[PDB]
Amino acid sequence: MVLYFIGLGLYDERDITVKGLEIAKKCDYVFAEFYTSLMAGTTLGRIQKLIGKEIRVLSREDVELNFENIVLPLAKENDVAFLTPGDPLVATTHAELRIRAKRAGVESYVIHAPSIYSAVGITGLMIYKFGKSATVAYPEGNWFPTSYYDVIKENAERGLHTLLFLDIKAEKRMYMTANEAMELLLKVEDMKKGGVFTDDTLVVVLARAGSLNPTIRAGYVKDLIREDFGDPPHILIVPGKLHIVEAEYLVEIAGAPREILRVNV
């Protein structure tokens, strides 16, 4: 009679919360999806071992189309777990899945886990200063999306920080690097000429959040555009005017150049 939406966390199989692990262990069936995002620091096998249950993986179609035929039927007479990377209902559309559960007469509960939305606090950037978020998507064919450029403009205009999710082809396990995102943004700048993103723009890169050894770097596009930030996933941030405290953290912790203490404050 119960369906548990359980967050897997940021990076590896230890990023799930104790609550989520123990509940997953007591469930009769455990499902998981890896199409909204991936757990770059672990594997299905490792996660299976930790939980001590076989995990049935579901595709985007299995969920978006046949969630009530695959998952809900079992949740009617058993305790079922549905695992997803990060924090459940975060940057996803699983929210409506709770409505599907309701109409099928199934109870559902959410077991939270860290999300990059909050994890980016490790960059030293104050959380309240973040504005609207966006995703940088790969252009393809005759399609060149640029709305993320406008989000940065509107945020920075109000002194707010912009969290930019980088394109990911989950099924193919292909990551867009921060380097690629920067190249894309410069190209967009060249087309819109808004003065939003240039070689002089200060950016922050967070790689492998959740890992004990994440890469946290800050500097101007001209110097970071070709830097190696390590293995994905990469997250790009375009800070607005930093607070003194923010800049100091970037310099002391993210190796930012002293120059930001006077140019970006």
Place this chain on the structure above:
Amino acid sequence: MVLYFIGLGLYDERDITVKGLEIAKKCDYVFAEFYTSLMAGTTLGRIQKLIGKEIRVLSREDVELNFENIVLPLAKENDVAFLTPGDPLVATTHAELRIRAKRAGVESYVIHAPSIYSAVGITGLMIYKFGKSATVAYPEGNWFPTSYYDVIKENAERGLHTLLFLDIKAEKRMYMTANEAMELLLKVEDMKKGGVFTDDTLVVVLARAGSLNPTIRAGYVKDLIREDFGDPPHILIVPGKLHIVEAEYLVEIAGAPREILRVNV
């Protein structure tokens, strides 16, 4: 020989990540603070039991004024952990404590935990649509804080949602409720008369996120301002222009007025 910033989670001792627990179990000394947020579903004892270590609780003054005198000295010869509610670097100034660690020659690591900042995803409001965040602070003496009113205005104009952290006076066991936040906002409205927060404003309340049965409610201020949302902690959200899919969830899951289903395009 290192210092661990470990988040404890939203509600109870089990909201810590498995990563955080295993690491905390092997530390020589464990410190903590419980003034930045309220974990309404656990106690110091339970946390101590789970981690299997005695925990020395610090006050805001101990941290802000003497962190390098109390904690850092031990971290020079031992493995030390500093525990906090939710995520240690979200809506706190703890980030700066990493700079102090550096100067003391102490390497520090951060272990994330579920945060209210991402847990709001359970309201059904899309996380990317949130703008600048703010805190509703208790007025003290002749001093009546009001900036949070302008944050709402700026966000709403942009059709963005506004997350409002509520005040907390831990040493006095005072936890601002959504009801008090609302009362204060109506007062600010009467003064600034910007038409930002009135009896007809649609709001969302999330209480005790992290527990299995949090209170999730959406509705007009006139109807919710005197509603009982249960024990603290609470957060208040003033949504921007709602997406049809956000409205549906608010209605089906948060008991919102069915009329919000009719969005004015």
